[PDB]
Amino acid sequence: GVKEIDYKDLNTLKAYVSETGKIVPSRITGTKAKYQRQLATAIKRARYLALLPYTDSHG
Amino acid sequence: VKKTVVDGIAHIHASFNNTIVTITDRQGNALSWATSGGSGFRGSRKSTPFAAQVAAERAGQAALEYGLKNLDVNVKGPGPGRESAVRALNACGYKIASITDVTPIPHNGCRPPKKRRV
Amino acid sequence: PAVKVKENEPFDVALRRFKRSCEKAGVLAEVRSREFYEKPTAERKRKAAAAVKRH
Amino acid sequence: MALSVEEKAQIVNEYKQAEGDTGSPEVQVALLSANINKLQDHFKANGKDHHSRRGLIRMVNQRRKLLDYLKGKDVSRYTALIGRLGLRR
Amino acid sequence: MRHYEIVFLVHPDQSEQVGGMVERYTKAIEEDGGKIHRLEDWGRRQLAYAINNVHKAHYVLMNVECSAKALAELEDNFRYNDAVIRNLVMRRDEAVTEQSEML
RNA sequence: GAGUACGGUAGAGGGUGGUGGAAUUUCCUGUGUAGCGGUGAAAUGCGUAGAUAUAGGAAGGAACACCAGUGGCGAAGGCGACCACCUGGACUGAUACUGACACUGAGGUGCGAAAGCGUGGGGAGCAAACAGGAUUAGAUACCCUGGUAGUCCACGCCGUAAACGAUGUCGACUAGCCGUUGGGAUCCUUGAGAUCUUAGUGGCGCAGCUAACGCGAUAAGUCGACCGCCUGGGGAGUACGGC
């Protein structure tokens, strides 16, 4: 599973997005520190382009 | 008069000191409202879940005159009565389609007041 | 912080799922923390104690 | 490290003492001088960049230390270096 | 001479001239040594939230290789054009050509 | 030892401009009617001139929820939204190069939280002063309602903090055990863990030291180079003079 984390790749992004739209901590998912830092920057960067909601109560 | 509204929305502005329940339509046009402080509960009793359901039940029957049977619950804010007011909406004739917490969460925005040195 | 009531279940169990969604999101804890302004010294002192207890 | 690899490769061969030489003081001083002069443009536009100025001062102190060592070793080589580079202002 | 990845949202009412805009940009970017290494069109996607009032927009993906002048000129086009909204310019250390969103 | 040349890695390192979402406030409009707000309880306050609540719209400023972590970067002070541009350093691997070019450092010079000061902007929230309401024997407070400077920005000044690890910098040596960040090497090529090594970051702990508390490879142990500082408490980091 040699996958590169990126903001377009939404399918694995939702795996690390909580039900309310937050980012799940690394403790819950057991993600490496390096991956989570790059994971977080992808979620925020994709959040900008309206690919993901900033929060569930948008509107 | 009778607006004859079938679908509504119920808002519970539960706070640490008072609980304000407001029944509104899908477009945010209010019909009835009641508060814990307006139900004879003043002071220590205004911040009690029992006062919250009395407010919800008082506004609940005032809202059936519009012929309202369906509503969505929009509870907002912390306090003793966020859930006790919703349980009052079940006692009177109603079915709740959804229950949603709409409590505002700043994303580290405006500075809150200082700690109380009580 | 948002649940949908389904067909043919009591409204009581609809409530219990609702607060279970609430503490999962932790909205009550968030509003409690934003009630008053915690100074950076008090916030860093709290987090240092949190790390000590965790270890 | 504001100098590109081309600029670094450019100035190393004009100041190398022999083939493959990148550690001789002439290369070091020339390497620092080109970086020192290049950064002057940045600090003109960015006058509040105190943190990057700490690195620039280090490059200035490093060049001074190298020139003082070259002073002791061979004064003739030192004289040609500053004349070619236009130091000792 | 730096690889830039650009993703911008076009207004849904201006969805049929996104081809007219992109063909203008690609011509206007390669006139000074630019090249397009990647170019998709994700189409009319439903927005997670309303940008200003629209809940859907025309996403365009474009990866280029330009200079400072060309990138500033292109970014100027995005700013003074109400057709495009919510643009983002990325810097890349290497050029890519895969899809990674179409599939 | 110190340094240079090359590839790469991580980062809230710094500076200059844009951009986003949540929320607060203010204003406009619709619904709607007796309270809202606050407290231990009240009252000042807001509200029948229609408040709070609710919905739609607009302006503006400030900080960047989740990620977030005895996590990271920085000489320290400090640095948390995203992106673009300019830029410093560190870590990492081998080869190549100079060949002691080093350490410390009185003077000196530079940076230095917050508050504060000057000029000009800006001002949503918070809030010294101030005003009113409570409490109290009194309350120049704690609590509540408001609220100015200030907090924000640019350019200058100040130069102080429990500026703390209350532990100067640099180099070498001295059992181990359990975590964690950025790398590297070998087994595992494993799909996926294990063993060494390095730069940090933590918790125990032998020896050793300590008045004790405790430190214990991030030493307060064994040494070496240099520097700064102390000589009972108060008077007093005050007076006087100098800058």
Those residues with Cβ within 8 angstroms of residue B39's Cβ, 6 or more apart along the chain or in another chain:
B51, B54, B55, B58
Is the C-alpha dihedral spanning B89, B91, B92, B95 positive or negative?
positive
Is it the case that chain C and chain B have 3 or more CB pairs lying under 8 Å apart?
yes
Side-chain-facing half-sphere of B88: CA atoms under 13 Å: 26
What tokens were used for C40?
A: 């950076």
- Chain C residue with the nearest C-alpha to that of B86: C15
Report which DSSP code applies to C37. Answer: B
Distances (CA, A) of B32 to A6, C9, D2: 50, 28, 69
Q: Which nucleotides of F are covered by protein (CB under 7 A)?
A: 2-7, 9-16, 18-24, 30-42, 51-57, 61-71, 74-77, 81-89, 96-102, 110-112, 124-127, 142-144, 154-156, 180-183, 191-192, 202-203
> Residue C30, by phi and psi: left (phi above 0), alpha (psi -120 to 50) or beta?
alpha
Check whether residue A24 has its CB closer than 7 Å to nucleic acid strand F.
yes
End-to-end CA distance of chain C: 31
Check whether residue B114 has its CB closer than 7 Å to nucleic acid strand F.
yes
Q: Which residues pair with E69 in a beta bridge?
A: none
In three state form, how does the secondary structure of B53-79 look?
HHHHHHHHHHHHCCCCCEEEEEEECCC
> Residue E43, by phi and psi: left (phi above 0), alpha (psi -120 to 50) or beta?
left
Q: Alpha carbon E31 to chain centroid distance?
A: 17
What tokens were used for B70?
A: 């369906």
Quick one: which H or E segment has residue D66? Answer: helix D50-73
Report which DSSP code applies to B112. Answer: P
Find the angle CA(B76)-CA(B78)-CA(B83) to the nearest 5 degrees.
75
Distance CA E42, CA E18 (A): 11
Does E39 reach chain A within 8 Å, measured CB to CB? Answer: no
Distance CA B74, CA C33 (A): 22
Find the angle CA(D10)-CA(D13)-CA(D14) to the nearest 5 degrees.
85
Instruction: List Cβ<8 Å contacts ≥24 apart for A27-31.
Output: none
How many residues in chain E? Answer: 103
Distance CA E82, CA B71 (A): 40
Distance CA D88, CA B117 (A): 65
Distance CA A7, CA A41 (A): 8
Distance CA E60, CA E57 (A): 10
Q: Alpha carbon B99 to chain centroid distance?
A: 12
Find the angle CA(A30)-CA(A38)-CA(E48) to the nearest 5 degrees.
95
Strand F proximal residues, D:11-70, Cβ < 7 Å: 12, 17-18, 20-25, 27-28, 31, 35, 38-39, 42, 45-52, 54-56, 58-59, 62, 65-66, 68-69
Distances (CA, A) of E15 to B11, B38, E58, E76, E83: 39, 54, 6, 20, 9
Q: Which residues pair with A16 in a beta bridge?
A: none
> Residue D38, by phi and psi: left (phi above 0), alpha (psi -120 to 50) or beta?
alpha
Distance CA E59, CA E40 (A): 9
Check whether residue A1 has its CB closer than 7 Å to nucleic acid strand F.
yes
CB B67 within 8 A of CB B95: no
Distances (CA, A) of E103 to A11, B80, E5, E15, E59: 11, 50, 19, 22, 15
DSSP assignment of D25-48, as one string?
HHHHHHHHHHHHHHHHHHHHH-TT
What tokens were used for D59?
A: 């490059």
CB E74 within 8 A of CB E16: no
Q: Report the candidate in E86, E103, E75, E19 with the shortest Cα–Cα distance to residue E48.
A: E86
What tokens were used for E15?
A: 């969805």
- Burial of B47 by CB count in 10 Å (0-12 exposed, 13-18 middle, 19+ buried)? buried
Which residues in chain A are closer than 8 Å to E101, comparing Cβ atoms? 8-9
Is the C-alpha dihedral spanning A48, A52, A55, A58 positive or negative?
positive
Is the C-alpha dihedral spanning E69, E74, E78, E81 positive or negative?
positive
Which residues in chain B are closer than 8 Å to A55, comparing Cβ atoms? 105
Between strands E56-66 and B95-101, the pairing is: unpaired
Outline where A1-59 has alpha helix (H). 10-15, 26-29, 33-48
- Burial of B52 by CB count in 10 Å (0-12 exposed, 13-18 middle, 19+ buried)? buried
Distance CA D13, CA D20 (A): 9
Q: Which residues of C5-42 are buried (b: 16+ CB within 10 A; e: fewer)?
A: beeeeeeeebbeebeebbeebebbeebeebeeebeeee
Q: Report the candidate in E101, E1, E23, E4 with the shortest Cα–Cα distance to residue E59.
A: E101
Which residue is listed with tokens 């389904």? C6
Distance CA C20, CA D46 (A): 53
Q: Report the candidate in B25, B22, B21 with the shortest Cα–Cα distance to residue B8.
A: B25
Side-chain-facing half-sphere of A7: CA atoms under 13 Å: 19
Instruction: Provide the edge-to-edge strand list for the sheet that holds B19-25.
Output: B30-35, B19-25, B7-14, B70-76, B95-101, C2-4
Q: Report the candidate in B100, B96, B24 with the shortest Cα–Cα distance to residue B62.
A: B24
Distance CA A39, CA D82 (A): 51
Q: Report the candidate in B55, B106, B103 with the shortest Cα–Cα distance to residue B77.
A: B103
- Burial of E54 by CB count in 10 Å (0-12 exposed, 13-18 middle, 19+ buried)? middle
CB D63 within 8 A of CB D33: yes
Those residues with Cβ within 8 angstroms of residue D24's Cβ, 6 or more apart along the chain or in another chain:
D15, D16, D17
Question: Which nucleotide has its C1' atom closest to residue B77's CA?
Answer: F53
Kindly tell me the number of DSSP H helices and DSSP E strands found in chain A: 3, 0
How many residues in chain D? Answer: 89
Question: Which nucleotide has its C1' atom closest to residue B41's CA?
Answer: F35
